[PDB]
């Protein structure tokens, strides 16, 4: 019913500690397998952190907040799902004795977590090292981190080309002191939307700039490409129009019957004549096209496309600029067909397609993927999004940070040094943040099999005297430098990792009561 006093603070930390404790063995490339027991006779052997917690039914509401935290992390970064949840769960565990046994007010701890978050972001920027974002050979070795241990490792070179050529098309990199700096905005969601074509080879997969249409041309003999195109978009079909009111044509006189039959053909030509007034080279309609409208527009020297989806024409309007106008008599001259390179109808996989591809980058592109089957295309799809997500974090900041527990320990050492110079009651919960940062590398040690206490203190000694680039090896499990075998990941992953971790930790600390009601 109601949880008052310190009982609510216990249940909020315990719920977040239980969610993190499950995936502690899910961290690292060597991470163990989790066998889940379904209410039925089935089982789940998947080690993916998101696929596990999704199949785990939770009761306490703080556990549901940790589930929604991983959903936000999945939209930002493609990997490291368990890294954020374990880190956010350990911070509440380390602040638990200070909140109760030491009797520190929670607002003091929350204000201390905001100071530790700002200091942590500064340390990550200091331990991060720059890399050339314009080097094609360097970007392939970066994305390769999210490539290997997958079926795409053989095509990885082609997987990086499809990843780079896609983000480089939709990215706008600008800055100045006049109109401001967009800070290298890249949209993978809307603009990079992909079309998967079965059959063929991965080498034949191209990134097309434009909107791809699966519908063919109404007539076999027609202009294949136009130099300076004029495009008209309209939802209305092409056929004889009828009045919305009651229309009855009574024919008595003998010679007036054939005249009305000619007018019906003239009305179809009139609707096409209103389109030809702007001299379009391309006509795209949502519904079908009558055979008469096909012949009238064929002699008019324009291209006709039929049975095109409405959602596709909306994406065409942004890369082109032609606005959909229902009635042919209302067609504006302001909307044009400029920046369309080729109409090429070339057949791909025994199926006629239509290409809107151009020579320019109107902040969007359509990726054409080829594979050996639909399951291969689905594997290329999800891997391409993770491939571009890594390339996105590299284009959203030049600096790379060492992984494998190197950055995790590098921050914890600097937090311990700033703790001695930070006066006030917030010093005690500030030291709990550094102890929570040591949980991630110690977790990789526990999954490796080595002594967690011995290897952690020795790894901390490497950061204190030597450099911060000495991490833990995944294959071996012994303390080594990350410069030898680069595990290096972009900094944006570490940025949003500690960022949302403090926001999720403070959110649960602010709730002192839980009641049930509608």
């Amino acid at each position: 019913e109601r949880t008052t006093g310190r009982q609510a603070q216990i249940s909020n930390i315990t719920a977040a500690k239980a969610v993190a404790d499950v995936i502690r063995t899910c961290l690292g490339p060597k991470a163990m397998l989790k066998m889940l027991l379904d209410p039925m006779g089935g089982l789940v052997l998947t080690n993916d952190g998101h696929a596990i917690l999704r199949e785990i039914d939770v009761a306490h509401p703080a556990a549901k907040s940790m589930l929604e935290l991983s959903r936000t992390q999945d939209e930002e970064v493609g990997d490291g799902t368990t890294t954020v949840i374990i880190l956010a769960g350990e911070i509440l565990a380390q602040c638990a004795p200070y909140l109760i046994e030491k009797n520190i007010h929670p607002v003091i701890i929350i204000q201390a977590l905001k100071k530790a978050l700002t200091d942590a972001l500064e340390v990550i920027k200091q331990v991060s090292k720059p890399v050339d974002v314009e080097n094609d050979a360097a970007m392939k070795k970066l994305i390769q981190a999210s490539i290997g241990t997958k079926y795409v490792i053989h095509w990885s070179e082609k997987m990086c080309e499809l990843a780079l050529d896609a983000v480089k098309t939709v990215r706008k990199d600008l800055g100045q002191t006049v109109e401001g700096e967009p800070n290298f905005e890249i949209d993978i969601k809307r603009y990079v939307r992909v079309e998967k074509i079965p059959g063929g080879d991965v080498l034949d997969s191209r990134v097309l700039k434009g909107v791809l249409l699966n519908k063919d041309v109404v007539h076999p003999k027609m202009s294949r490409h136009i130099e300076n195109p004029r495009v008209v978009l309209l939802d209305c079909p092409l056929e004889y129009k009828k009045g919305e009111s009651q229309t009855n044509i009574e024919i008595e006189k003998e010679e007036d019957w054939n005249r009305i039959l000619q007018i019906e053909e003239e009305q179809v030509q009139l609707m096409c004549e209103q389109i030809l007034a702007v001299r379009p080279t391309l006509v795209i309609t949502e519904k079908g096209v009558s055979d008469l409208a096909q012949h009238y527009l064929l002699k008019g020297g324009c291209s006709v496309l039929r049975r095109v989806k409405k959602s596709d024409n909306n994406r065409i309007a942004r890369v082109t600029g032609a606005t959909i106008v229902n009635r042919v008599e209302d067609l504006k001259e302001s909307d044009v067909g400029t920046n369309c390179g080729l109409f090429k109808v070339e057949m791909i996989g025994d199926e006629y397609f239509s290409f809107l591809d151009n020579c320019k980058e109107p902040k969007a592109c359509t990726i054409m993927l080829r594979g050996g089957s639909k399951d291969i295309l689905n594997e290329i799809d999800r891997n391409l999004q993770d491939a571009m997500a890594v390339a996105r974090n590299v284009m959203l900041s030049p600096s790379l940070s060492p992984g494998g527990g190197a950055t995790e320990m590098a921050v914890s050492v600097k937090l311990a040094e700033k703790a001695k110079q930070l006066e006030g009651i917030q010093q005690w919960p500030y030291q709990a943040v550094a102890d929570a940062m040591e949980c991630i590398p110690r977790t990789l040690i526990q999954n490796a099999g080595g002594d967690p206490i011995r290897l952690l203190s020795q790894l901390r000694a490497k950061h204190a005297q030597g450099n911060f680039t000495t991490g833990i090896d995944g294959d071996k499990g012994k303390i080594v430098d990350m410069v030898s075998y680069g595990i290096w990941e972009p900094e944006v992953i570490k940025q949003q990792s500690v960022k949302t971790a403090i926001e999720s930790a403070c959110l649960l600390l602010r709730v002192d009561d839980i009641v049930s009601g509608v």
Partner: protein, 230 residues
């Protein structure tokens, strides 16, 4: 760290249950192996008793709640589609390998090192697999060697008296369907038909096809030799 209506086995306690789960499935299937194996009963619940020594039919007819035996049964089903023989052999290798590993788990050895030791030894096992194997000639006059392969697949599931009955049947069934060349063989061309009223030791091979409905009339010829077909 618990919520209502939940159960969790943690901190090496799941390993003691999973290894025991393999020891329970192993000891049941340990009884039937090779020609000296044993026969078991499978009740479908409808009252039909079925006796078979094949581990493929056994694992499908039994229902096991233990999730460790489920993965063994699912993986053996993939082995039954690929290999088609040695279902018990795979189970006996899995159970004993976990027993030898569980002894090292009690010693404090991390399971990753244990699994890494299996993959390294498996790669070395594949090297000895190619060295120990014997290359047999492609000659189809090898029936003498096919008599040895037949007794391998027969003697296991039978009293060895049906072996001498089924040895010329199975060996002649393969070579008659198989043309002489390297092309392929079709198992669908061999029909499997069952009849009652006569002892199993009288099982014979049919070079042609067998059918049920015959000519009905007392004066129709019973034996017609070298006749045209319509």
């Amino acid at each position: 760290l618990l919520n209502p209506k939940a159960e969790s086995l943690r901190r090496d306690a799941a390993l003691k249950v999973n290894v025991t789960s393999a020891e329970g499935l192993q000891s049941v299937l340990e009884t039937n192996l090779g020609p000296k194996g044993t026969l078991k009963m499978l009740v479908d619940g409808a009252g039909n008793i079925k006796l078979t020594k094949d581990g493929k039919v056994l694992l499908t007819e039994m229902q096991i709640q233990s999730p460790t035996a489920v993965l063994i049964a699912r993986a053996a089903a993939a082995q039954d589609e690929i290999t088609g023989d040695g279902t018990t052999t795979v189970v006996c290798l899995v159970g004993e390998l976990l027993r030898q590993a569980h002894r090292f788990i009690q010693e404090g050895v991390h399971p990753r090192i244990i699994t890494d030791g299996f993959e390294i030894a498996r790669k070395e096992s594949m090297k000895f697999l190619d060295e120990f194997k014997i290359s047999k000639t492609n000659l189809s006059n090898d029936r003498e060697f096919l008599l040895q392969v037949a007794r391998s697949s027969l003697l296991t599931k039978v009293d060895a008296d049906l072996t001498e009955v089924l040895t010329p049947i199975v060996t002649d069934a393969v070579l008659s369907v198989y043309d002489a060349q390297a092309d392929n063989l079709d198992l669908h061309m061999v029909e499997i038909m069952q009849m009652q009223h006569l002892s199993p030791k009288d099982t014979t091979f049919i070079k042609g096809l067998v059918l049920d409905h015959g000519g009905r009339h007392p004066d129709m010829p019973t034996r017609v030799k070298n006749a045209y077909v319509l």
